[PDB]
Symmetry: D2
Subunit: 163 residues, 4 copies
């Protein structure tokens, strides 16, 4: 699609790495390959990619995602947005940036499924975006919450959730 954007939520060393402060360990690490391939997909079409990061070394992007970001961060289709709450839209210009660019569809990847992803997805929903949350592209430390949130995205938010 041409009116689509990728939202990469809080994929930082502190959340993903084993020696990270508030880490998610292995599950957040198991989505690295899928996120890297979603970034390349969007970049191929010069679709817009937003890296959304909690503001507070540890706040650098994790692993291959952080590596890829270093090589594309100057491109006009790549954005880095500091956020102060879990919800990527709260107190940020994200919605206005998407609207400027005629985006009405977001794909959301990152961590955690039932916190920052969920809060971001709910705001995307209220703001009238079409939503995709691929189950291979999100993770949580809480298995019950991960499964709870994927069904919430599908059944309450009308989101495409591909297994």
């Amino acid at each position: 699609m041409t009116h689509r954007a990728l939202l990469v939520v809080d994929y930082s060393y502190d959340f993903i790495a084993d020696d990270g402060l508030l880490t998610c360990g292995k599950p957040g690490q198991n989505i690295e390959d899928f996120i890297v391939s979603r970034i390349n997909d969007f970049n191929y079409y010069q679709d817009h990619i937003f890296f959304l990061m909690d503001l507070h070394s540890g706040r650098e992007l994790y692993g291959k995602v952080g590596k890829l970001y270093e090589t594309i961060k100057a491109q006009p289709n790549v954005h880095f947005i500091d956020k102060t709450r879990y919800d990527s839209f709260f107190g940020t210009p994200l919605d206005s940036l998407l609207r400027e660019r005629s985006i009405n569809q977001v794909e959301i990847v990152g961590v955690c499924t039932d916190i920052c992803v969920l809060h971001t997805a709910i705001s995307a929903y209220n703001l009238g975006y079409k939503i995709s949350v691929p189950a291979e592209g999100v993770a949580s430390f809480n298995q019950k919450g991960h499964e709870w949130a994927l069904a919430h995205f599908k059944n309450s938010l009308g989101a495409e959730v591909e297994q």
Copy 2:
């Protein structure tokens, strides 16, 4: 204690363990009215101008008894989140409210979305376990934990 409002989320004929919380909700409505504290009935707009859209049961009866009072408010909403597209935030700030108690249904949908907006907007949040309910146990329990561990809410099991 002092600067508080009650949000009664979506407690309608059409959505209503919803009947099991009826008595607790009525007592919380009476508790806030017992101090002239502000009570907001938030209702999805559930066809307009129909009987399925009325407040259910004893809660509906109590509402009819206090609806004209200046501490009682009825707000129509268009999404699950009670704050979205409504003047709820502005009405709470007019009245120097920094504390909300949230009751009604469903725990992991309208209550959750309302709680998240409350949280983002800087309100202190209490969601008593006895005053919310959901169609599914796993969502109910997930949401009560979310309220406590992520939103910093008070989620008292017993009052």
Copy 3:
């Protein structure tokens, strides 16, 4: 690509009749013609009204169209039609990206609504014949603001 809606701001008897919005009497006929032109295409029309009945021919036109799917009535609590209302989400639901604003007062309710529309990324049109203010200085200041700062067609 242009997808448009008309915002009719605070065109009420209490603002307009002789019993700040009083020059709103001047614009009755032009507002009616805007509503008729949008309704010819089935474009969406929003009547925005302070929540503290529509004046004249606009009121009589409203009764013959009020039940149609393209006609909406929204209560507001501040000057800004977008504040504390579902207006932005109703526009988004319908893929609207341009709003034409008529009503009163040019430098108050129209001004606050236009700024919100601008911030939310809507293209704006405020025809000079479709807005009034008893404050002629403010009227003239506000129309220049729309054009010069909000990028509006005036």
Copy 4:
């Protein structure tokens, strides 16, 4: 009970300097300095709000000495309105702020839009006539009366 913050709107080189890319804002410099000093004496919070797209003169020099303090904040904004797309309202609410004083430029553009949003969000507003300026003297005068008569502001 009043708890106040200072909003210093768009007092940059390019809006104020004779050579600035999009330039009477020079004449309010000393008054803005005194307001910043007055709020800073009490450790009241001060927010510098700047278009994204450096602070002018004595305001910039003063900022360099206080910028690391917990009561001093720098906020980038993408529209005229200081509240739009920014965490400004959340930062003010976090600190129990209920009143804002607005200074800077231009009276009838970024100050106006900032003030309208503060009004809608329920803040008590002060816009001292000596602390705001605009090229458009007609818009300056219009905007000042608007603050007093529509937004219930204190305009001293």
